[PDB]
Amino acid sequence: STGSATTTPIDSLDDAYITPVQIGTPAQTLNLDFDTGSSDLWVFSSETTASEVDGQTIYTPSKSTTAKLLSGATWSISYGDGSSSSGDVYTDTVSVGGLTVTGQAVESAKKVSSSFTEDSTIDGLLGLAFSTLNTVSPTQQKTFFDNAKASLDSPVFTADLGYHAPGTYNFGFIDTTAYTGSITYTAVSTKQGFWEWTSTGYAVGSGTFKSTSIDGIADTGTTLLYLPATVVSAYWAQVSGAKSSSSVGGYVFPCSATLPSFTFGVGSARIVIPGDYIDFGPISTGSSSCFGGIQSSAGIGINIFGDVALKAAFVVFNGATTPTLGFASK
């Protein structure tokens, strides 16, 4: 089998992407944030504290003839951005772009943190990291991909995120029309439960390529590109008027400045992030100070190839017995 679904930016800055997901019978369609940095499929629901729901579409398990309580199960997650949610668990039928999994754990939120409430466009998350990170207790549950894998034509999914435009998540096949050149595959460590890999280096604009190992994760659920402070400083040094602002919480720059591209290495291949992808707009409405899309990972504890990086590539998440990652230009 295969599936194919369009993913759509939530706003004009590509702060996140939402993908429609059918849950239950009859289908309830919720717009979920596909997150290769986590491993829980959780949704706003009829069980979510009323004061914490503000515009989201909810899953109501009592209206699904295929929903079954996963008795005794609870879940609770905290994300890198300080947000959190928790609740109980049902199993139900979940379909993405024509691909159906029966018996998928659907984690129903009883509580969500303020950032989730405040984002009316995201009805929940669909985790696509390794199932070892799933938070359901006492019995850890499998991701949608893990459940689908054996049925897929090939045990892979791909992320093709757009810049200020929709893109595509495919399951079970590689669309050879969606990228230019070849796909370069690179080793993955699953030891932390992430799609963790090692970039071979970077360049800033037309500068020479610096060969240096950068371990990080391919994370569709993180907006920006977070890299070591040395790398990030080298980038912003090439932008007139850029500075790191402790009050704002990262590098900012005047919108009158031209942003150079940023290149990252995948083996001997190179992915070029155009300068425009690194502009995240005014820090506040009407400000001449713009927020940068490349920021320091210092104090995160890991480098993160988030959407800024991934949207410059066609990315293969290969779930073969030994997982790997593939990157192509597009």
Side-chain angles (χ1 to χ4, degrees), residues 28-39:
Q28 300 180 40
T29 301
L30 276 66
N31 294 329
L32 306 187
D33 186 350
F34 282 25
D35 182 11
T36 62
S38 69
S39 307

Side-chain angles (χ1 to χ4, degrees), residues 1-4 96-100 148 151-154 156 170-174:
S1 61
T2 62
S4 181
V96 175
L99 169 66
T100 301
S151 304
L152 294 179
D153 291 357
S154 183
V156 306
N170 291 330
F171 293 83
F173 71 105
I174 289 162

Side-chain angles (χ1 to χ4, degrees), residues 161-190 192-212:
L161 303 179
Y163 166 67
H164 294 181
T168 306
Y169 281 103
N170 291 330
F171 293 83
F173 71 105
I174 289 162
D175 179 358
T176 62
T177 72
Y179 59 87
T180 63
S182 56
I183 305 178
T184 296
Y185 288 88
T186 195
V188 164
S189 170
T190 63
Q192 297 189 89
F194 300 122
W195 295 90
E196 188 172 2
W197 64 290
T198 300
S199 173
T200 50
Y202 71 97
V204 176
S206 59
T208 56
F209 187 85
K210 175 78 170 176
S211 288
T212 186

Side-chain angles (χ1 to χ4, degrees), residues 247-326:
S247 56
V248 177
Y251 283 89
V252 298
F253 67 97
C255 323
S256 54
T258 285
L259 296 181
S261 60
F262 184 89
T263 300
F264 64 92
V266 182
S268 56
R270 304 290 180 253
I271 301 293
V272 181
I273 304 170
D276 283 346
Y277 289 28
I278 299 160
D279 181 4
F280 279 76
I283 58 169
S284 291
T285 304
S287 182
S288 71
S289 184
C290 286
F291 198 67
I294 296 175
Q295 299 291 348
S296 180
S297 64
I300 296 177
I302 198 156
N303 299 305
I304 307 174
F305 294 88
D307 297 336
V308 162
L310 306 180
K311 76 181 74 173
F314 178 87
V315 189
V316 183
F317 296 78
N318 170 26
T321 305
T322 299
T324 63
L325 275 169

Side-chain angles (χ1 to χ4, degrees), residues 90-109 112-141 143-146:
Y90 295 85
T91 55
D92 210 340
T93 303
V94 174
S95 300
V96 175
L99 169 66
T100 301
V101 170
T102 59
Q104 174 64 46
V106 177
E107 304 170 33
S108 168
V112 304
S113 66
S114 58
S115 65
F116 288 114
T117 299
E118 289 162 0
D119 183 4
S120 70
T121 71
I122 289 174
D123 301 325
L125 266 67
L126 189 151
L128 292 168
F130 295 88
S131 294
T132 52
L133 294 176
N134 177 267
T135 75
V136 176
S137 178
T139 309
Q140 254 206 340
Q141 298 296 300
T143 71
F144 175 81
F145 179 55
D146 213 341

